[PDB]
Automatic annotation (TrEMBL), chain C:
Residues the record lists as N-acetylalanine modifications: 1
Protein's organism: Sus scrofa
Entry function: Accessory subunit of the mitochondrial membrane respiratory chain NADH dehydrogenase (Complex I), that is believed not to be involved in catalysis. Complex I functions in the transfer of electrons from NADH to the respiratory chain. The immediate electron acceptor for the enzyme is believed to be ubiquinone.
Protein name: NADH dehydrogenase [ubiquinone] 1 alpha subcomplex subunit 7
Cellular compartments annotated: Mitochondrion inner membrane
PANTHER family assigned to the protein according to its UniProt record, in alphabetical order: NADH DEHYDROGENASE [UBIQUINONE] 1 ALPHA SUBCOMPLEX SUBUNIT 7 (PTHR12485:SF1), NADH-UBIQUINONE OXIDOREDUCTASE SUBUNIT B (PTHR12485)
Ion transport keyword on record: no
GO terms under biological process: mitochondrial electron transport, NADH to ubiquinone
TrEMBL record, chain D:
Covered residues, full protein: 28 to 123 of 123
Positions of Zn(2+) 2 binding: 68, 84
Organism the protein comes from: Sus scrofa (Pig)
Keywords of this entry: Electron transport, Membrane, Metal-binding, Mitochondrion, Mitochondrion inner membrane, Respiratory chain, Transit peptide, Transport, Zinc
GO cellular component: mitochondrial inner membrane; respiratory chain complex I
Disulfide-bond pairs as recorded: 84-87
Protein name: NADH dehydrogenase [ubiquinone] iron-sulfur protein 6, mitochondrial
GO annotation terms (biological process): cellular senescence; circulatory system development; DNA damage response, signal transduction by p53 class mediator; fatty acid metabolic process; gene expression; kidney development; mesenchymal stem cell differentiation; mesenchymal stem cell proliferation
Every Zinc finger CHCC-type domain range: 55-91
Self-association and partners: Mammalian complex I is composed of 45 different subunits. This is a component of the iron-sulfur (IP) fragment of the enzyme.
Family stated for the protein in its record: Belongs to the complex I NDUFS6 subunit family.
Gene it is expressed from: NDUFS6
Localization: Mitochondrion inner membrane
Signal peptide (UniProt feature, chain positions): none
Membrane topology per record: Peripheral membrane protein
UniProtKB/TrEMBL annotation, chain H:
GO BP of this protein: mitochondrial electron transport, NADH to ubiquinone; mitochondrial respiratory chain complex I assembly; reactive oxygen species metabolic process
Function: Core subunit of the mitochondrial membrane respiratory chain NADH dehydrogenase (Complex I) which catalyzes electron transfer from NADH through the respiratory chain, using ubiquinone as an electron acceptor. Essential for the catalytic activity and assembly of complex I.
Positions of the NADH:ubiquinone oxidoreductase 30kDa subunit domain: 47-166
Listed name of the protein: NADH dehydrogenase [ubiquinone] iron-sulfur protein 3, mitochondrial
One GO CC term on file: nuclear body
Keywords carried by this UniProt record: NAD, Translocase, Transport, Ubiquinone
GO molecular function terms listed in the Swiss-Prot or TrEMBL record: NADH dehydrogenase (ubiquinone) activity; NADH dehydrogenase activity
Subcellular location: Mitochondrion
Recorded superkingdom: Eukaryota
Recorded name of the encoding gene: NDUFS3
Main location: mitochondrion
Quaternary structure note: Core subunit of respiratory chain NADH dehydrogenase (Complex I) which is composed of 45 different subunits. Interacts with NDUFAF3. Interacts with RAB5IF. Found in subcomplexes containing subunits NDUFS2, MT-ND1 and NDUFA13.
Organism: Sus scrofa
Catalyzed chemical reaction(s): a ubiquinone + NADH + 5 H(+)(in) = a ubiquinol + NAD(+) + 4 H(+)(out)
UniProt family annotation: Belongs to the complex I 30 kDa subunit family.
Automatic annotation (TrEMBL), chain K:
Name of the protein described by the UniProt record: NADH-ubiquinone oxidoreductase 75 kDa subunit, mitochondrial
Covalent S-S links between cysteines: 33-36
Superkingdom in the source lineage: Eukaryota
Binding-site list for [4Fe-4S] cluster 2: 30, 33, 36, 80
UniProt: [4Fe-4S] cluster 1 binding residues: 83
Gene: NDUFS1
Species assigned in the record: Sus scrofa (Pig)
Residue intervals passing through the bilayer: none
Similarity section: Belongs to the complex I 75 kDa subunit family.
Subcellular localization: Mitochondrion inner membrane
Domain 4Fe-4S Mo/W bis-MGD-type: 99-145
Function: Core subunit of the mitochondrial membrane respiratory chain NADH dehydrogenase (Complex I) which catalyzes electron transfer from NADH through the respiratory chain, using ubiquinone as an electron acceptor. Essential for catalysing the entry and efficient transfer of electrons within complex I. Plays a key role in the assembly and stability of complex I and participates in the association of complex I with ubiquinol-cytochrome reductase complex (Complex III) to form supercomplexes.
């Protein structure tokens, strides 16, 4: 859906209402999850002080996202280097305390709640306008315009056959993905196809530091640790 | 004592196939990179391509 | 696919909250699956005059990277002014 | 219309039918050769030719955005009927 | 210009020394692969294959190249030791399922249009 | 430059054993260094400014089921680009591939003149506009 | 100074009960280690400037919170940590000595990436 | 706005990044070959390959840099260059919320000092550059294949390497094993030659040679 | 703005410590955990009765590919090969040849469902709305070869799901 | 006509709860211990 | 060029003209660059192509029915910058972005004109001229095309 230049097509009529209805009740489900896990003496024993990471060790290990926020490091790309319109919504970053599994889990739940707040703000501040950049050389023209006008047809043909030529250069753009700082180093050459697209993956760095976390911890603690990273090997293996 | 992770058990050559595809053609690759957070990957790629193209999406 | 009043009290007491007010099952509050046709607006460049692409061009106004030193008192500088310490959230400081 | 080759194989609209001395027909036994009976070559033929009263006429295929890109056909040659290159509909000047 | 950085060795003799000790490790290893990996090829039937693999790239003369394949062979030995390769991975060295290919020109002409 | 007992390695560079290319696909192939010719359909020369290296076309048979263009030549769709001919031949020799470089053809500078279209003595006078 | 903070926030960073003295001795050590660097080198000039200013600010302010705001380097413990890091950097840069001119011009067009 | 589609341009960030580029160039003239700021406010420092350990350490430890997070470490292969491999370091400074790029060059058979000592996150990254491209990193705690299958022969991300490789896998019942065979695709990858023969951007027009 | 998620020191009043000891000995939060699951068992299950009950969809749903045709009967496809040129997985193979009448139509239009990624890029690229992603998604096959779609199979899908696909496009073409 | 697209209602959507709502319930520790001890005493008698 | 249009009227349409079994003509696509006319006059010698009328209705053709028959006729297909003149045997067979181009030498005549064989799916689709400036300039004969 999200594409260079905006979004593919506009939201179907009557979707904001459904999103509001769902987000109204999602708080109860979050509270139920908390009541299920937060204060349980079993969960609070398998995740408290299990997998502690130091602040400087976390920074040096290339960690990002929760594993920084979970260990006192006050960093979040949504606030420090805002992208899109993240400089408008108001939210709080759940800074962690101890750096263990329990602290990171609490951080994740609080991020869920803050994201619910951001969803409410986005629903209440939807502006009028179009969906893609008003440039038929980087965004395909509307299907109505394509079937009526010369330039729209030509641009649609060339965009869907050749594509938009990206100016030569290289960039590294990263965002606060729900896992961490997901980034891309995109290197173009002036043609219609990329020359080198390297993917910076928080999962890669987090799994690189798995051994440092699991020191003296038993196998069950390792089961907890490879879960506190939310490790996904689609992103890791690229 | 030691825990060596042997990743690559799902290594699709994504960063190699991306070159052979155009920027629009490479968009679905990022959706298939992280399968639990999806629109964020497309958002990152779109921001990169927009920054390279020196264009900005509409406020909506 | 409605519970009796006796049951609702048992569910509410076992959970400690009014579940009937906020349920996870959508009954009728959803938007109707058939909707009136939409009329999408136009962008800021759907003008019949003063709409030359030279002004609106985005790709062609990207200069090559600017070199600041090549191989072919002066106060120390910084990449940017230092970050400013974050403040506690007045909404809910301590969880 | 779909017709039967001497072997027994139905020919498609593309004129495709495996030869008798072709082993590939083995795939079709105990199965059927999936073909489309509604031939576009025939179905467009009996569509009436519209008697357009102008030198040129615009065709969009019907339905506006639902159809094909709008194109203008020049109806000047009395020996032929202008046919849209997208949908195949014909047009003709009223006896010129 | 004509003179460039070295990888590990500073002459051909040291590169040959490293090749020698790598062959030492492989030759000592082979029966351990035969037993541990439950291989069915004879011990000699693996040692001669190690010899043939060493003899394959016996024509190289750039030292840095020799150190590079020394490291690569060390990595393959590392994989073979701590059961990182499996039975199929090891058996790939003996190309078994591959039909034998012809060497004379006449058979190649008979079989297809290739060099 | 590099103070690590900087060693003379005069003999020519060769990574034929460090690329993983099998036996067959390293001498029986013949790369071709050439500047691509302009597509005569068009009239733009922006595709005739970079040297290209390509491999000889091999067998391309039809798939029995559907009729695809089945092939068994991995180095068939791989074409490298190079800024200069010398760099391309350096890459070809470095990887041990036989080459046959073709020189870059350049359009000879013509001599255009509008006046010759309406000459008085010569045969370049056009009979139409 | 004032009431000592219970924790520094970031884990691992233990609260330092002697911030002013630690900062003073670290800055003096940094200056003395810099003294070995030749004066013409930019490292010496810039680091001496920065350490001189920050030493002055440390000497002036006796309030820990006001010193924290003035140095603009997060909490004080981060400031001692980064002062130690700069001391180690100067110690290693003694050996590296980047004051010497460029080691080697890049070969032709290693840069210039329209290709 | 007058530029509703053109991405807004920030010039203050450009000035700050240029100032820091001159700062780094003056600090380490031994290795810093060429520094440049892109139009979208990203600073790149091209250093000699010997300056991998020093320069990074400086950027990690200096009070005015404080780049304490190796975001990404990658390589770009350009066959037309002498030293084709081009190693890229991306660093992020959380104190000055700034991103920097340190780019060095290296051929096929030239080693690079491993930055594991400086950035312990690099330990895995380096292996990837070794596995994908073949750049050997000396003084590395353990260099091994990280992504390719065991016994793989070649470096996939190299330009002179087919995207389909040379060997495919199959299961053979005769040997009851997952054997490897020469590659043979049912449908060959249709190579599309999509490139307009008309110059796109006059700004990046290479002067004739 | 940031919040300390776990920075709460427990009170050390005799009542507080008595309550903590009571919770430890007489398991209290454990009983709350039991009560939550008791409350949800007494709640209504969310399962639907497939295949007699189907999960909701939208008119934009991407499913089985199909070739549409004009109301007259002529196919919409004109072999412009935009869909083949835009497919990220190269799943479309097109061979064109001028028909006997003269109109340019595909002599071969094969879409490989085993290689398709169901992105919908083809249906956007098509300038005549010839190729679409139908609403069908229950088309699993027992053999692999049945997923290699021919022109005839795609035309059959277009003739079969035309009633649904025409309505789906009618309810969505204005958004595009 | 006018433009039509999915929009929030003219007055905006209602409030969205996000804070934790873990309710407090149960007797005090003294009361719980007293009930347990009283049950033990009655059973003993 | 721009990325939209401000033309809100009816376009023109031109009756097609027949010039033989090699060059298919869709004259409504003609931009009237008169390049085919100049090529026929000078390179081909035969003065059978030209214009008719004036204004927006001035059309490029032969007026009377007369096939453009010459050994170098097919080269007009290359000369036309638009799809007004197209190769009849190649009509509706392949797209330019998908054909692999292989340079070769013509063997029909003895001039040895350099050509580009564009093949897709292991099948020859069309022969285009390749510029040499000594052998064939940038033209080929019809027996070569
Ligand atoms: C199969 C199951 C087990 C798993 C798989 C077992 C086989 C794995 C093999 C891995 C190692 C790799 O193939 C080879 C390498 O690294 S280096 C080979 C020697 N090549 C050179 O050193 C170059 C120059 N060559 C010489 O100098 C002469 O060849 C010689 C060394 C004999 C000296 O001779 P002189 O003295 O006469
Ligand atoms: S929807 Fe299917 S057929 Fe269409 S482009 Fe995507 S993968 Fe290819
Ligand atoms: S995009 Fe549509 S008209 Fe063009 S070839 Fe594909 S199906 Fe046919
Ligand atoms: S070459 Fe083509 S566009 Fe030019 S005048 Fe002739 S037919 Fe028209
Ligand atoms: S491809 Fe060119 S000549 Fe053909 S219709 Fe489009 S603009 Fe006209
Ligand atoms: K033409
Ligand atoms: Zn029509």
């Amino acid at each position: 859906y999200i594409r260079p230049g905006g979004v593919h097509q506009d939201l179907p009529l009557g979707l904001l209402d459904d999103i509001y209805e769902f987000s109204k009740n999602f708080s109860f489900r979050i509270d139920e999850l908390e009541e299920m896990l937060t204060n349980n003496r079993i969960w609070r024993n398998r995740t408290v002080d299990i997998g502690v990471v130091t602040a400087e060790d976390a920074l040096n290990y290339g960690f990002s996202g929760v594993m920084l926020r979970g260990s006192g490091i006050q960093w979040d790309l949504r606030k420090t280097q805002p992208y899109d319109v993240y400089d408008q919504v108001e939210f709080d970053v759940p800074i962690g305390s101890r750096g263990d599994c329990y602290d990171r889990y609490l951080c994740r739940v609080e991020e869920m709640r803050q994201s619910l707040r951001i969803i409410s703000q986005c629903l209440n501040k939807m502006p009028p306008g179009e969906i893609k950049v008003d440039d038929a050389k980087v965004s395909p023209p509307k299907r109505a315009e394509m079937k009526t006008s010369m330039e729209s047809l030509i641009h649609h043909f060339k965009l869907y056959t050749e594509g938009y030529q990206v100016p030569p250069g290289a960039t590294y753009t990263a965002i606060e993905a729900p896992k961490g700082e997901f980034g891309v180093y995109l290197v173009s050459d002036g043609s219609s196809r990329p020359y080198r697209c390297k993917i910076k993956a928080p999962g890669f760095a987090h799994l690189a530091g798995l051994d440092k976390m699991s020191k003296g911890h038993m196998l069950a603690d390792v089961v907890a640790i490879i879960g506190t990273q939310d490790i996904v090997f689609g992103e890791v293996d690229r | 004592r030691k825990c060596d992770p042997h990743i690559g058990l799902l290594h699709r050559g994504t960063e190699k196939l991306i070159e052979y595809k155009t920027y629009l053609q490479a968009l679905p690759y990022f959706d298939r990179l992280d399968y639990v957070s999806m629109m964020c990957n497309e958002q990152a790629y779109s921001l990169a391509v927009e920054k390279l193209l020196n264009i900005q999406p509409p406020p909506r | 696919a409605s519970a009796t009043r006796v049951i609702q009290l048992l569910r509410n007491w076992a959970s400690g909250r009014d579940l009937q007010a906020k349920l996870q099952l959508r009954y009728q509050e959803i938007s109707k699956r058939t909707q009136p046709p939409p009329k999408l607006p136009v962008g800021p460049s759907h003008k019949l005059s003063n709409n030359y692409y030279c002004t609106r061009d985005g790709r062609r106004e990207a200069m090559p990277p600017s070199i600041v030193m090549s191989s072919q008192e002066k106060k120390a500088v910084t990449p940017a002014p230092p970050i400013k310490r974050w403040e506690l959230s007045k909404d809910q400081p301590y969880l | 219309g779909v017709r039967t080759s001497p072997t027994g194989e139905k020919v498609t609209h593309t004129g495709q039918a495996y030869d008798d001395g072709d082993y590939r027909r083995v795939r079709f036994s105990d199965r059927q050769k999936e073909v489309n009976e509604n031939f576009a070559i025939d179905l467009i033929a009996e569509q009436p030719v519209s008697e357009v009263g102008s030198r040129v006429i615009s065709c969009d295929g019907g339905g506006g955005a639902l159809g094909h890109p709008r194109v203008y056909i020049n109806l000047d040659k009395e020996t032929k009927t202008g046919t849209c290159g997208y949908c195949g509909l014909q047009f003709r000047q009223p006896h010129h | 210009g004509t003179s460039v950085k070295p990888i590990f060795s500073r002459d051909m003799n040291e590169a040959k020394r490293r090749v020698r000790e790598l062959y030492r490790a492989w030759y000592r290893e082979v029966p351990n692969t035969v037993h541990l990996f439950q291989l069915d090829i004879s011990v000699k039937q693996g040692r001669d294959k190690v010899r043939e693999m060493f003899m394959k790239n016996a024509h190289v003369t750039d030292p840095r190249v020799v150190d590079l394949l020394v490291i690569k062979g060390k990595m393959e030995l590392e994989e073979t030791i701590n059961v990182w390769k499996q039975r199929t991975h090891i058996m790939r060295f003996f190309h078994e399922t591959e039909a034998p290919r012809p060497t004379d020109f006449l058979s190649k002409f008979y079989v297809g249009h290739d060099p | 430059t590099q103070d690590t007992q900087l060693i003379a390695v005069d003999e020519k560079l060769d990574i034929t054993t460090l690329t993983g290319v099998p036996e067959e696909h390293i001498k029986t192939r013949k790369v071709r260094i050439f500047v691509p010719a302009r597509n005569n359909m068009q009239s733009g020369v922006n595709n005739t400014k970079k040297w290209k290296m390509e491999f000889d076309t091999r067998e391309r048979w039809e798939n029995p089921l559907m009729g695809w263009s089945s092939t068994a030549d991995p180095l068939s769709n791989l074409v490298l680009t190079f800024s200069t001919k010398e760099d391309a031949v350096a890459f070809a020799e470095k990887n041990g591939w036989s080459f046959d470089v073709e020189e870059r053809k350049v359009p000879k500078p013509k001599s255009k003149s509008y006046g010759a279209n309406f000459s008085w003595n010569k045969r370049t006078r056009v009979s139409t506009k | 100074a004032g009431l000592l903070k219970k924790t520094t926030g970031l884990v691992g960073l233990a609260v330092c009960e002697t911030p002013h003295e630690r900062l003073k001795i670290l800055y003096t050590k940094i200056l003395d280690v810099l003294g070995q660097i030749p004066k013409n080198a930019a490292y010496r000039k810039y680091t001496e400037q920065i350490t001189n200013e920050k030493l002055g600010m440390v000497k002036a302010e006796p309030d820990v919170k006001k010193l924290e705001e003035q140095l603009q380097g997060g909490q004080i413990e981060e400031v001692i940590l980064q002062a130690e890091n700069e001391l180690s950097l100067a110690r290693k840069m003694l050996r590296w000595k980047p004051w010497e001119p460029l080691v080697e011009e890049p070969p032709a067009n290693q840069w210039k990436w329209p290709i | 706005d007058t530029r509703p589609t053109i991405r807004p341009r920030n010039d203050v960030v450009h000035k700050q990044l240029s100032a820091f580029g001159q700062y780094v160039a003056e600090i380490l003239p031994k290795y810093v070959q060429q520094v440049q700021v892109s139009c979208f406010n990203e600073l790149e420092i091209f250093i000699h390959p010997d300056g991998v350990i020093p320069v990074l350490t400086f950027l990690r430890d200096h009070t005015n840099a404080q780049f304490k997070s190796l975001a990404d470490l990658t390589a770009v292969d350009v066959p037309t260059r002498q030293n084709r491999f081009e190693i890229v370091y991306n660093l992020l400074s959380l104190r000055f919320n700034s991103q920097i790029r340190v780019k060095t060059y290296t051929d096929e058979l030239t080693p690079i000092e491993s930055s594991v000592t400086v950035y312990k996150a690099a330990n895995w990254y380096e292996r990837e550059i070794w596995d994908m491209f073949g750049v050997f990193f000396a003084n590395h705690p353990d260099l091994r294949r990280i992504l390719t299958g065991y016994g793989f022969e070649g470096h996939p991300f190299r330009k002179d390497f087919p995207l389909s490789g040379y060997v495919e896998l199959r299961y053979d019942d005769e040997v009851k094993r997952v054997v490897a065979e020469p590659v043979e695709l049912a449908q060959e990858f249709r190579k599309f030659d999509l490139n307009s023969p008309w110059e796109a951007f006059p700004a990046y027009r290479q002067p004739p040679e | 703005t940031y919040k300390f998620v776990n920075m709460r020191e427990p009170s050390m009043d005799m009542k507080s410590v008595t309550d903590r000891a009571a919770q430890t000995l007489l398991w209290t939060e454990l009983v709350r955990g039991l009560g939550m699951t008791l409350s949800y068992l007494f709640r209504e299950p969310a399962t639907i009765n497939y295949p007699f009950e189907k999960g909701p969809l939208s008119p934009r749903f991407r499913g089985e590919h199909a070739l549409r045709r004009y109301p007259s009967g002529e196919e919409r496809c004109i072999a412009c090969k935009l869909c083949e040129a835009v497919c990220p997985a190269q799943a479309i193979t097109i061979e064109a040849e001028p028909r006997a009448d003269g109109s340019r139509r595909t002599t071969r239009y094969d879409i490989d469902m085993t290689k398709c990624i169901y992105c919908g890029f083809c249906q956007e690229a098509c300038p005549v709305d010839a190729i679409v992603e139908g609403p069908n998604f229950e088309f699993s096959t027992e053999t692999h070869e049945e997923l290699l779609y021919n022109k005839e199979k795609l035309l059959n899908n277009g003739d079969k799901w035309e009633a649904e696909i025409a309505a789906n496009i009618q309810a969505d073409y204005l958004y595009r | 006509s006018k433009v039509k697209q999915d929009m929030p209602p003219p007055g905006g959507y209602g409030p969205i709860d996000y804070k934790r709502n873990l309710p407090r319930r149960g007797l005090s520790g003294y009361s719980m211990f007293a009930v347990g001890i009283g049950t033990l005493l009655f059973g003993y008698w | 060029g721009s990325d939209r249009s401000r033309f809100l009227e009816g376009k023109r349409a031109v009756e097609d003209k027949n010039i033989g079994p090699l060059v298919k003509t869709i004259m409504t696509r003609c931009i009237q660059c008169t390049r085919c006319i100049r090529f026929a006059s000078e390179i081909a010698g035969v003065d059978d192509l030209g214009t008719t009328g004036r204004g927006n209705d001035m059309q490029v053709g032969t007026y009377i029915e007369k096939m453009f028959m010459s050994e170098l006729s097919g080269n007009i297909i290359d000369i036309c910058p638009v799809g007004a003149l197209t190769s009849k045997p190649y009509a509706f067979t392949a797209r330019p972005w998908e054909t692999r181009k292989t340079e070769s030498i013509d063997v029909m005549d003895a001039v040895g004109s350099n050509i580009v064989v564009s093949t897709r799916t292991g099948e020859v689709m069309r022969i285009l001229p390749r510029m040499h400036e000594d052998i064939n300039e940038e033209w080929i004969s019809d027996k070569t095309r």
